[PDB]
Structures are given as C-alpha cells and as structure tokens.
Design a protein around this ligand. Structure first.
Ligand code: GTP
Ligand code: MG
Lengths: 141, 199, 139, 168, 109
C-alpha cells in the first residue's frame, strides 16, 4: 500500500513538473506568435469586452486570438478533453448550440469570424469564458 | 486491490505528456502540402480558394517567424509584418516596396508581381537560413535548390527538377510542385530547427 | 441461472476474463420501460441491455476500434446463453497488445466505473464515478 | 431439445417408502436405515423422452398425520403427485385412497396422479392384491405400478410414466 | 412512521425517469470530490442534490439545478462537512433531505 502510493505520487508529480514548465512556456513564449497574455484576462464575471478585441488587434490579432484551440491541442499530448471542444483548424470559428441527441450541427449558435453573429455572439462567447474561468480557477486552486 | 488502472494512468499520462516538440503540423495531401489543414498550392485543374491560400500564407509567415526565433537565425534582408491571411514581407533589398503575400487583386492583376517579389525575397531568406544552419553542420546536408531570382524551388537527387515560384498565369507544374518541394525542405528545416532548439 | 451472459467469443464460459471483467458497476430498473446498464471493466465501458429487445441492444457508450454488437442469444440446454458478438472487441486472458490502458476510452479518460447511476432533473441523464475520485456526466 | 419443469409431490402414510423411492430415482441409492422425514424435503431429477428433458421439482412430504395440514402448501400448484402405499399394509392403502380423494377435491384439476404400491419385494407378505389396486387406479385415471425402492423395480418406470402423461 | 423524520429532518418525494434505451449519451460534464477515491455516492430526489465525499472523510456536495443554471458547479463544492474520520458508508434517509453517514471508528450520525 505504502510503495504503490509512493510510486503513483512520484510518477504523477514528476511528470507534471517536467511539462508544467513547457505549458508555462506555451503561454510564456510569444516569440513564435505575438500578443500572448500568460494567465491574465479581463472577462472575469464580465460577459462582454473590447479592451483589445476590435480595438488594439487590427484584424490580424483578431484572427490570431481565435488560435487558442491550438494551445488546447498542445495540452492534448497527455490526452484529455476540455469544457468547450478543443480542435484547432487555423484562423476562423463558429460556436455550437447543444449536444445530447442532436442529428445535425449547431455551429450557427454564434458566428465568430464575422461580427454579424453579434446577437447570438452576446451568448456563445460566455462558453469560451466558462472554459477560461474553469482552467484559471484550476491554476489558482 | 486498486492500483492497476492507476499504473495505467501514471505511465500513459507521463508518456503522452512528453509529446510537445513543434508548432504547426504539416500533412502531405494529393499534390500539395497542407499546413495545419490549410491547402497551399492551387492545382492546374482547380484554383483552390484564395482565402485558404492567403490563410495558408498567413500561417506560413507565423511558422517562419517562430523557426527563426528558435534557431537564433535573423532575416537581415527582411522585416515581417503578419496581417493574418493578408500578411506582408518588407524585403530591405526591395525597400519594402511591394510587401503583400496575399495574391488576388483584380482580373488583370493575375499578371501582378507583388507576391513574386515577396517569394523571391522569401527564397533568398531560405538560402540565408540554409547558410545559418550550415554554420552549425547540424543533422543535415543541402538536398535543396531554388532559382530565387526567377522564382524557383528545386529538389536534388532522383528528380533534379526546379519549378517556378510564379504561376505567370495559372498555377500548374510551376508553383504547385515548387510549394510541395519548398514545404518538404521546410519540413526537414522544422525537424532540424526543432532539434537545434531542443538541444 | 435462468440466463447467463458472457463477453466470450465461445458460447460456453471459457475463463477468458482479465480481473477487471469480474469487477464492475451495474444499474437496473424494476420499472421505467425495463432498461439495464452494465459496465464491462475489461473494456472500461458502458454497455446497454434492454429487456424490451436483447437483439437490438445498442450500447450507450462507444469503443475506439469497433463498437457494433450482434448480441444474439443462443441455447445450450441449461441456460439461454447470450453471445455478445461485439465486432472486434480486442480482449483476452493476456497482454497481446503493447499498451491498451488509459488512452483507449470514449472521450473522458478514467479508471473503472466504481458507480454508475441515472438521474432526471430535467431530461434523463447519467453519472459515471470512477475509482480515481473523478466523475463524468452524460446526456 | 427443450426442458419442461414440473412440481411433483409425494404423499402417503409414514414408513411406506416415499424418501426411499425418491432416493432411488434421484441418487440410484437405497438405505435400509433411511430416516423418517421432518416437514418436507426438496429433490430434483430429470428424465428424457421425445427429445424433451423433463425436470421434476420434487417435494417429499413427511407422511405423519401431524403434518397433514402442511400438505396443501406443498401440493398447491403441483402438476404431478405420487401417492405411495405399502403392499404389505392394507391400511396404508386405505390412507392412500384418502390422499387420492383429497387430491381430487383440493389439488389442480390437471394433476397427473401416480399410485405406488411400494415394498413389492416383500410380495410373500402381500396384503394388497394387485388387481384391487389396479381397479382403483383405472377407475380414477391414476398411473399405477408396484415399485420397490430396495431392488429398484419400476422406480424409473413410474417417473417415466408420469413424464409421458404430463403436457409437454 | 416519521417520529424522527419530522423532529429536525426535511422531506421530499422520489422521481423516476422515462424509458432510457432510446438516448445515446454524450459526455456533458467532468469533475472530482478530491484526488482520493470516492467513499460513496448518493443523489437526493430533491433537485437531484448530489452528495459525494473524499476517502479522507471530507464531504463534497453539489446542486444539479444550480449546474443546469449557472453551469459553474463543476469548479467548486456546494456543501462540505467535517466527519473527523474515514467514511465507511453512505445512505440517504428515504423521503428526506437528511443524510446518514458511518465512519471506520464505528461512529454513526
Ligand atoms: N423391503 C423394503 N423396504 C423399504 C422399501 N422402501 C422403503 N423401505 C424401508 O421402509 C422404511 C421407511 O421408509 P421411508 O422411505 O423412510 O418411508 P417414508 O414414506 O419416507 O416415511 P415418512 O418420512 O415417515 O413419511 C425404511 O426402513 C426403508 O428402508 C422397499 O421398497 N422394500
Ligand atoms: Mg420420508
């Protein structure tokens, strides 16, 4: 019982440590791609914002910011899901409505690349905010 | 009676966790390289959509910028201004005169040369990169060639061929085969750079 | 034993079970349209078995290789033996695959389902509690 | 092949040989020192005929008259009965008739009743004439055989006769 | 019938589902009591109030209707209790919001 716990704790803590730094690095290295944020966000209990989004970001960083699903897919090496589906196909998006027993796609729930989804976009942005707040709380404790 | 799937967890998790080592995944498809899904190089039979091409060019700028800043190679003859799918390269050898890497720009501008200057500049920068890694005599040789001035990408061994970096009109064997081989050289380059960055 | 159900390729009970085949959660209903749900701890997954149709018993949880199950009941006199003809289940009494552990699950990696239960606050939905202090919910 | 299950009850006066009859059928055994049954014993055995496995669920009742009141609990839903007497005991045969009567009045109307004239190995002390018992059996649609648990005479045969008559 | 159940306890009534062979299940949520194995699981009839605990004897409870609404419920415990010893068993009081727990010291409450 003792040795098994020791082994398990040891392997777990060690293997966390080894890539914790690389995960830190995955937010701490904008050398590859500019305008990172390293575990700081303005959406805390704040369902809408423009502090950078359509302001300081000038189309390019607006399309680059949507690449966050690649960081999720980078997390994916040690295989596990996340609270909003973490697939990256480059620089465009739309958000699903629901999934228990649907037969067709729900990505019309809020368009992300065009501003024209705006009414629906007031809602589905809350999903990625929920994804963020879960991971942040999990970093904090 | 508990620790069996625990031993599963610890072994699998640690082994999997170790997999992070590169930025953008590239997969060969048909007669083009696809970089993080985006197709690069329109077929003679089918002009692949310009937003996909431009997006592929956007991400290609993002990749080069990363690889450079990882090896410590710096592009003297260039300044890089990514603007998404509409990215641009200010070649100092051309005083940043015609930076756009994006392609379509009017019906007659099928003859346009903005991207050709950017691709000549880019292929010169690939020669620069080749020398900058050659200095290290790393895991590599020089299997690659490129007639950068006329726009060309070239492969050495069995094929020997070089195809042009300019479509002139249609992307054909020129352009599409050039992109595929240039991407093969970049795949090699990404492997060698990832090694050098890791080391 | 009016019935005897086996994951075995053979109709008699060949002792092909790894230890986790014998160690599993189960949930059944004496009411509510007569559903039954069954963890297979060998395959770490949730099978379904409907008292309404044993032949049509579509499982609720998936498999990475080949999920589909020809659940046909045969007879050898003494028991109405259910041949769970899972198309390519890929399990046996020894380790004839290099890894075959936590990476091989319908999305949501885990230890064996210690407990599984159904609740119905709005729709019906189900919870899987694993040995790992960890839970996943399905709808 | 198919399996048919039937509840069978053994009834009759104490010491007539009910437990011996069933031990012979079930186990192929016989004990001179068989113990008198208290309450009721459960036993099971099969026969095969016409591709059908016929499985008897047997209630071997204590014959003692104090346990009379318990008998209806054991023959309720019984599809077959064997009422056993001792061929050396004419009174055991009088008691056998009264069991047959109770069955006619209080058991399932479909019941297949066998009559066993047991201890037929002691035929030199016969008290009950074969043809008297047969006449009573015939008159009441009972399956009658003289049996001997001791020698095994007609033991398998009486259970097979029951199996044949039962709805299958 | 209810001499203890109406002294300090609350009350509720049971809620069975429709036939459930029809639905496929898609994984909607993920969470944890603690890293330690779940001592036992119980789900209330009232609001499907979800009761769970760590092996250590530290309680971990949640509100299903709160999760249906706020959706935050996976991040943090709704309710805890100090047992002061390793939980040996759990069972809900039938028809009640009260919960009965027993510990490896023989102590029950
Ligand atoms: N000679 C002879 N003796 C028998 C035969 N069958 C039974 N006996 C003996 O008769 C005695 C009583 O037999 P049991 O089988 O115990 O009789 P029972 O009808 O079950 O008696 P209870 O349980 O008291 O109702 C025992 O000594 C048996 O060995 C037989 O066929 N021939
Ligand atoms: Mg007896």
């Amino acid at each position: 019982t003792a040795k098994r716990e020791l082994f398990l704790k040891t392997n777990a803590q060690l293997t966390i440590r080894c890539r914790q730094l690389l995960s830190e690095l995955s937010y701490i290295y904008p050398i590859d791609l500019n305008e990172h944020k390293d575990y700081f966000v303005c959406g805390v209990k704040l369902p809408n914002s423009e502090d950078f989004q359509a302001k300081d970001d000038g189309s390019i960083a607006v399309a680059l910011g949507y690449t966050a699903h690649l960081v999720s897919m980078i997390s994916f090496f040690l295989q596990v899901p996340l609270r909003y589906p973490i697939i990256h196909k480059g620089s465009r998006s739309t958000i699903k409505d629901n999934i228990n027993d649907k037969l067709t796609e729900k990505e019309r729930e809020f368009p992300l690349y065009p501003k024209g989804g705006e009414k629906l976009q007031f809602d589905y942005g809350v999903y990625l905010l929920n994804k963020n707040i879960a991971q942040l709380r999990y970093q904090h404790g | 009676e508990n620790q069996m799937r625990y031993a599963q967890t610890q072994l699998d998790k640690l082994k999997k966790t170790n997999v992070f080592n590169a930025t953008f995944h590239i997969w060969h498809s048909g007669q083009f390289g696809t970089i993080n899904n985006f197709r690069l190089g329109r077929l003679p039979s089918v002009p692949v959509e310009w937003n996909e091409i431009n997006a592929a060019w956007g991400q290609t700028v993002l990749l080069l910028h990363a690889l450079a800043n990882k090896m410590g190679l710096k592009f003297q003859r260039y300044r890089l201004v990514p603007y998404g799918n509409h990215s641009y390269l200010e070649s100092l050898t051309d005083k940043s005169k015609e930076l756009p890497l994006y392609c379509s720009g009017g019906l007659r501008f099928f003859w346009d040369n903005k991207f050709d200057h950017a691709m000549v500049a880019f292929l010169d920068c690939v020669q620069q990169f080749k020398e900058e890694v050659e200095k290290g005599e790393t895991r590599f040789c020089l299997p690659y060639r490129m007639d950068v001035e006329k726009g060309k990408i070239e492969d050495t061994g069995g094929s020997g061929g070089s195809y042009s970096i300019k479509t002139q009109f249609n992307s054909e064997e020129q352009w599409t085969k050039a992109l595929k081989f240039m991407l093969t050289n970049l795949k090699w380059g990404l492997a060698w750079v990832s090694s050098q960055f890791y080391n | 034993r009016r019935f005897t159900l086996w994951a075995s390729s053979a109709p008699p009970l060949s002792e092909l079970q790894p230890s986790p085949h014998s160690v599993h959660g189960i949930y059944c209903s004496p009411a509510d349209g007569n559903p039954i749900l069954l963890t297979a701890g060998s395959d770490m997954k949730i099978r379904f078995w409907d008292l309404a149709y044993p032949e049509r018993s579509y499982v609720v949880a998936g498999s990475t290789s080949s999920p589909s199950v020809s659940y046909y009941r045969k007879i050898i006199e003494g028991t109405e033996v259910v041949q769970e003809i899972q198309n390519k289940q890929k399990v046996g009494p020894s380790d004839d695959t290099p890894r075959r552990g936590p990476e091989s699950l319908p999305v949501g990696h885990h230890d064996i389902i210690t407990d599984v239960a159904t609740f119905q606050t709005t729709q019906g939905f189900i919870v899987t509690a694993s040995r790992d202090g960890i839970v996943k919910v399905w709808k | 092949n198919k399996i048919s299950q039937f509840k069978l009850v053994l009834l009759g006066e104490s010491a007539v040989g009910k437990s011996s009859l069933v031990l012979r059928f079930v186990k192929g055994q016989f004990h001179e020192f068989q113990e008198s049954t208290i309450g009721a014993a459960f036993l099971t055995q099969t026969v095969s005929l016409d591709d059908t496995t016929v499985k008897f669920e047997i209630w071997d009742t204590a014959g003692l008259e104090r346990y009379h009141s318990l008998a209806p609990m054991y023959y309720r839903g019984a599809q077959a009965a064997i009422v056993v007497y001792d061929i050396t005991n004419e009174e055991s045969f009088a008691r056998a008739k009264n069991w047959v009567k109770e069955l006619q009045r209080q058991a399932s109307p479909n019941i297949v009743i066998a009559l066993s004239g047991n201890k037929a190995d002691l035929a030199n002390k016969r008290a009950v004439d074969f043809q008297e018992a047969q006449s009573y059996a015939d008159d009441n649609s009972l399956l009658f055989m003289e049996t001997s648990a001791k020698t095994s005479m007609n033991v398998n045969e009486i259970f097979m006769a029951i199996a044949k008559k039962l709805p299958k | 019938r209810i001499a203890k159940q109406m002294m300090e306890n609350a009350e509720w009534e049971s809620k069975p589902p429709p036939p459930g062979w029809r639905p496929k299940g898609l994984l909607v949520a993920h969470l944890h009591e603690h890293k330690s194995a779940v001592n036992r699981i119980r789900v209330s009839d009232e609001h499907s109030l979800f009761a769970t605990c760590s092996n250590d004897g530290t309680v971990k409870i949640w509100n299903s209707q709160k999760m249906e609404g706020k959706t935050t419920t996976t991040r943090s415990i709704l309710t805890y209790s100090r047992i002061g010893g390793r939980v040996k068993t759990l069972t809900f009081c039938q028809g009640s919001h009260y919960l009965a727990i027993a510990s490896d010291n023989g102590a029950v409450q």
